[PDB]
């Protein structure tokens, strides 16, 4: 006989092939496969089938365009070579053709399966495991923070010593010309010296563009100098500078995954 039973979410159709007289089972996908793919998959399995076709129970051939899901709603007649097999094992037991009466069995099944499988404890287990990871990551960083702060507190002082040294440079260069050119000296000698200092500053601000590949602005130079004092100063203390920005880029993702899990809009 030809039967079909639902295993593992899918229909399984058994059939009796003519050559070697042995049965076979076909596990066929209802939503994607047409009834042409199934009749190709029969002839793949036993090449001795010349004519194989599927009939609606009232005559007409169910042609090879329709779906398996459209075809397992009602019964049908399989015809292999000469024999017949009228197969009516689909057994669609749902007798409603109604919306809510069929939908409210799904909540019964899912709410039974929510209680039988202890899943709310699994959800709280995952919500525990995430912070269990995050507090390991907060403690790997915690003793090694106290050398990064040590390097930063020195590089800050060196950058501040650069900045006020530059302001002292301008405070001295003002005073040299102020002392000379008003009363100690002439004015008409200190005019080209002034012009050439003002042009040499424009030359050095271009040499800084050449030697650095960026523009000379005030807050885009002291940050470069701070970082260049940080990496040299952290060569000497040797605290695995790649491990720090490897650890931060994992705590900043577990911390985001906790925010995306605890989102009160969706019940996780």
């Amino acid at each position: 006989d030809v039967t079909v039973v639902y295993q593992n979410g899918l229909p399984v159709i058994s059939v009796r092939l003519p050559s070697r007289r042995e049965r076979c089972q076909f596990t066929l996908k209802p939503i994607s496969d047409s009834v042409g793919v199934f009749l190709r998959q029969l002839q793949e399995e036993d090449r001795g089938i010349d004519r194989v076709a599927i009939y609606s129970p009232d005559g007409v051939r169910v042609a090879a365009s329709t779906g398996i899901d459209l075809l397992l709603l009602d019964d049908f007649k399989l015809v292999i070579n000469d024999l017949t097999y009228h197969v009516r094992p689909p057994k669609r037991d749902l007798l409603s053709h109604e919306n809510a009466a069929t939908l409210n069995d799904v909540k019964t099944l899912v709410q039974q399966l929510y209680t039988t499988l202890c899943i709310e404890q699994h959800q709280l287990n995952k919500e525990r495991e995430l912070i269990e990871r995050l507090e390991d990551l907060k403690e790997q960083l915690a003793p090694l923070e106290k050398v990064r702060i040590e390097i930063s507190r020195k590089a800050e002082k060196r950058t501040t010593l650069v900045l006020w040294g530059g302001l002292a440079y301008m405070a001295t260069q003002f005073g040299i010309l102020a002392r000379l050119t008003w009363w100690e000296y002439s004015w008409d000698i200190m005019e080209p010296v002034t012009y050439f200092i003002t042009y040499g500053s424009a030359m050095a601000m271009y040499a800084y563009f050449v030697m650095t590949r960026q523009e000379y602005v005030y807050p885009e130079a002291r940050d470069r100098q701070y970082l260049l004092f940080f990496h040299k100063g952290a060569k000497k203390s040797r605290f695995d500078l790649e491990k720090y920005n490897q650890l931060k880029d994992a705590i900043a993702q577990a911390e985001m995954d906790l925010k995306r899990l605890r989102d009160p809009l969706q019940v996780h």
């Binding site: 405070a171 005073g175 040299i176």
Partner: protein, 49 residues
């Protein structure tokens, strides 16, 4: 600038503690050092050339 994208108000921008007197007390002594270093270099340059 003054208002955050939600509508709040930005906090106070930090000024330096004892702010203006550090500028006013680094400008003056190095102005006097540039005062001294000009005349006591001209006293070397005027008499040897």
């Amino acid at each position: 600038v003054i208002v955050t994208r939600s509508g709040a108000i930005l906090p106070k921008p930090v000024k330096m503690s004892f702010g203006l007197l550090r500028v006013f007390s680094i400008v003056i002594p190095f102005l006097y050092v540039g005062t001294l270093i000009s005349k006591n270099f001209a006293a070397l340059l005027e008499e040897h050339d």
